[PDB]
């Protein structure tokens, strides 16, 4: 695309992440809420601002994924580049279908509440932030094989990608650590235990959200590099 | 008023009487699901819905009042109307007064709900149909009067105030059936009379619906009349 | 206004004197079917269509006493122009309300349809009638001044003046034997009288149809002229 | 198909799936109207939306067996899933001839309504239905040979063919209770009758649209799995 | 005041609860924030929002004290009303004096911040605490004085008064809690410190938006008792 | 006075300060401007700014004094404190006489600028500032005084002593060294010095709002504690 | 565009240089309290306080460059200055792109303030500040091509563009010592260095606002002379 | 416009008239202040002065292009009128530029003020005024143009139009003159030629307020006559 493409997108980039944050401050509100006094419409109410959450997720990953497509076109694709390019829109398609898979359940627990129905939301919200994680390690990739196919020389490109690396190792061990205590809460489901999982989850969207904010950053370094 | 003003306020009425049917017909959907599927979520859910039913209700009110008003200085005031006229404004405060009333004790059973919450949130809810129920008896006295002070001898108006008697009747019936069964449910209070009781508030505000459409047609042959 | 206005106007006038053509040959269509095939649900939909060939109608008469307005302002107000307009005004805003009045009632039609409804709708239409024939009637007399305040002596014109008040008798005989029918349904009600009565409905909304091809006709004549 | 056309797919069938449900509500809405008011021309109204309400699901069911048809094409048909895919397509022209065949019917009545054409109709629609489940076994069948095909291990989708099943037998016991009221009706047709049976059928159509989200879920667990 | 005044301020004193709600949600969010990073300019930045949500609680009990003198001019004083006001009159001048305060300290520790800083703040910020809780017991016995001198027997206002009172010794014990941990950060002031003292002036902060909604809610019910 | 008296007019007090902060920010920008590109008509821009901002501590150290008489009259004067305020409204009549001398010079040397007359002004602003500074003194003296007298224990209150103290003899020092190098600009007078000495009358200057705001921390305090 | 956009635009061009103007005075005051003062959030806070300035810089900029596009619409385009634009249109996106990182990272140092994060940060706006000069010199290319294209005799003119070359070549200069005093900072980064360096950027974007003003006169002598 | 716009419109005229009137007087005041006691700060004090006179010139020519605007309208363009009103909106836009010119110049003298930036100030002032004369001029065009338009027979008329083209002719003579001695000044800049220059600026802008009384009265007249 042309500079004043991607400089809109960038734009729309940044306004995302600005919702973005603004969601993880209300959801970590309504998270410390439902900490006090939990009850069971808190629990449903705060599984549907967790899916509201996540779709600004995947909208930003849509955005990014839009923003690297105009960046690549402007560069010239490569071997590796477009193998991780058809990567991508397939983990984006995924992305897709998991979440309107999650909006549906979520529709059904809303519907028809109750503790098991919560514990089967949470497994779910567990495994679509699972192929959040996936689609990030690929954007990530992407990122990692634009800076080697330029031979950008800037520190603070490799900067921002030591940065990169170290948030997505993290993201791995933080995804492990949330699949651990979902395995225990599916072994053994309670409302103490509903309310710890869903903290638990709220800690891993917010270390995704750091992870987006690292991607911006590469991806602003990249378009001034070039 | 203009008959600019009074034509505007009438299309701001005839608005305002198709969204109110609007969510009569959803709050009866919503009714139905709640029979069918009832829930603590559910309960709660449907009580805030019933609450912004009522908030259209009295903004109805409310430019129905503007109506009258610009309605009366265009004929001019009267004693008994000018005596009515202040009731009129003084239930209209009463009304807002017991609107906010209504919404923070819905807030107070959104965030911390129980049994024991809906309960007394339906009480409320009772209290608050009653009051928009004598606003609208003090509503069809004033109606009453305009049309008596200008004499007006059309038997359209006539029958349409035949038609307003008796709903303002009926509404005095379904109102003192809707306290009894209120009273019994502050008795005997469970999840089968919380059903049975929203039944019979979603039947009750279908009969206050009912004299606003007759409100309006009252207003409408008035303004023809004059 | 400028001519790129008062054109632009006139085109509008004229698409929605199409649509009203248009609307007229479709309600004589469903009026014959009636008239062959005459049923409870047959009158309730004939109904419904003449209160949507209405509201046609009375949007044609906006755009009419839209565009004299513009016309006024580009020749000048005149004393008895002013009062006209005036009075214009005002039986445009009277037409807005009886025709939320129609469309209310025909609500109530729709929802509880009876014999004694289809009376009181049918009376009700002949009624709201007899006010767009009253519209007529002020923007004929508004057209004679502005035309007479003009001086314009185009033959043209004149003739085209002599068919507006050739329509505007005939017109107010129709309302007249229209008005004596509606008397005798209300009288002695029945479901043949209702379908003659329907026809002759449909005769006068043709006889209106043909006043507001006339006053477009001065309409142009006049914008040519000036 | 490819990845972006299999989720856009599945974007449309959330789309139809939302569109369904909204009608489903309206049409429950419409159901308790006619249930307070009865009336001929509430008889006929009922029916035609009952008849807008089925060709939604008609293309409800169209989507769905596109996508399967992508869905297959993606793992490769077999023996017993191609002979499954040829009953569906079958099935599908099947559905699109009765529903001309309803259509067709449904304008006869609206044209020509009375009391036996109210009986003939709702028989005819008892009979679309019918055609539909028989849509929905063989949708359900395929399904069910798609993922043993696969041999796909994962408990969510064992968990949702579960569902899957039963929503099946579920909808055969409810279509066999719908026959037999159908007889009784077609034996003893009275207003109450059509009233009742009106309300049956509702029934019968909202566990349609129960079995139509279980076989969406199970279609996006298999777009996962693959 | 009239009718419309009381409503009217009670709308100002509702959106005013809405906005101190807001503030308290934002205030838990920073504290997290601030718990999870402590920082010097952390600390100095939460400081600044903490005095931001006392101005706004200070609008708060400044609104409620109009009101009050509203409603009681409505009534009529009383011997203890009337020196309850004066009490109440004197308890706001005194806030406003500590407001301003505040104010200046707070900006003495914007421009020069220091740990020393911090801990003069948050023992100022504790005695501002302590002057709004006890104009919050005064506003409180004018409301018991009020309540007693109608006479009221609502059992609404009844159950209302004893949430009053049981959140006013609640109050009590909140703020000399606060007194004795203030205390300790004065004998052994750290970083460690001055977090665990932050969070437990947001939860002392928190009770005392508790205790505006149930003085909220004992207005709401005399002004619809009177 | 009574309370609100005293409130009022401490939130005038401190509009006051916030007027003087602001006031001094701008004359340290002029003074940067002026250092950067010093010139003839600079200097008597300067100059006359430096009036404008004098003005407004003198109007500060009225209200305080206003202040004071009003917190005196509350406790009760003394022997000492009737001595000082005699001594504080003598300084007063003082500084109103001499703030008038400055400006009448002021308009001399705006009509007619020279060295000479810069010169003059100088020395004229730096006795001015002397006479504020012996204000300051006794305003000091005199709050020392109503809290021996009041015999008040609050450490809050000693500490502001302390620095009301510590900022006195600063004040002392600071003039002495300005009235020093007055003497040096009078022996040796040249634009450069005339610059160098207008830094150091800014600088005086701050320190004197520094005083005041030391000053108004104890009025605060002593209002508070009485 | 048309003399009254060309017109307007240049009351935002003033508007906007005002506002500039008074933002340089405001960072030079509190550059002054931050070196008198010097403390961690002190430092932050006057960061935060450049990257608003620079935001201004950037939005008059932007609309230099819009009145520039109208001017030379007016005049028609050259092959010299169609490239310059194109080279124009470019650096305006960098520019957005650069201004969007520079928050994003301002954002980062207000949350996790350090030493090693406000040198980060300084350099990081000293890059803002190189891509600002590179705006303005393409600018001034521009603004000398469009007068060489008129060959505009105005001795004016000519004294407004050596005074636009000086500027030019002296924010070249200024640029190369700033940026060699980054690298003396990054390489000895200290509390005493972040002082000096801050300093030094206050003096850069002031020699920025300089060269702002007189491409604004050139603007406005080329309006006048066309 | 209606009459009450132009009526209010010519009150503005008549209030911007006593306000120009009111500010001439003031800066003869100065005038002959700067000729008895001339100095540095007194020049720029005065420049300063007339830029200020110079601003209330252009509100009083911007209100009387708004009358004239009205005035047409109500009267009918014609092909010279337009032309001569194209010709005046042109002359009004290139009026705000100069304007802005002006005061930034303005600016740049009270900033950094020398002989030289007198002298160049002045000459500034001189071309300002030069196009002032030339709104003027086309100003009188218009209402030469507008007077012969209507055929106005008023000798009252036909006088103030002796006197308004004597004016021009006037007014063209000494801005050929202020030009003359401009060209001097730029020649041979000296104070005493500063003084003797400023002397004749205000001679010249005194004759300029003349043309405006003039050109009020005949706008008056016009007025009048329709």
Redesign the interface.
């Known amino acids: 695309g042309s ?2 493409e ?2 809109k997108a ?2 729309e980039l ?1 306004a995302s ?1 600005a919702e973005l944050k603004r969601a993880t ?2 959801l ?2 309504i998270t ?2 439902l900490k006090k ?1 939990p ?4 629990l ?1 109410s705060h599984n549907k601002a967790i899916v509201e959450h996540n779709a600004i997720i995947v909208e930003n990953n849509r955005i990014i994924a839009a923003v690297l497509e105009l960046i690549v076109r402007a560069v010239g694709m490569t071997d590796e580049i477009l193998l991780a390019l058809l990567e991508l ?2 983990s984006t ?2 992305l ?3 979440t ?2 999650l ?3 979520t529709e ?1 627990l ?5 503790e098991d129905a919560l514990v089967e939301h949470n497994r779910a919200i567990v495994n679509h932030n699972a192929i959040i994680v996936e689609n990030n390690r690929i954007i990530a990739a992407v990122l990692e094989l634009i800076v080697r196919a330029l031979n950008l020389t800037d520190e603070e490109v490799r900067k921002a990608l030591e940065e990169l690396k170290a948030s997505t190792a993290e993201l791995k061990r933080a995804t492990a650590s949330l699949r651990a205590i979902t395995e225990e809460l599916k072994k053994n489901p309670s409302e103490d235990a509903l309310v710890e999982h869903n903290r638990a989850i709220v800690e891993h969207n917010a270390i995704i959200v750091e992870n987006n ?1 690292i991607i ?2 590469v991806l ?2 990249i ?2 590099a070039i």
Request: proline share 2%.
């Open positions: 500079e004043e991607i400089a960038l734009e940044v992440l401050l209300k970590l509100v410390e809420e006094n009850s069971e419409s808190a449903v829109k397939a398609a995924r897709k279908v998991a309107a898979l909006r549906m359940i059904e809303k519907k028809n509440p109750s904010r911006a950053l602003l370094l378009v001034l």
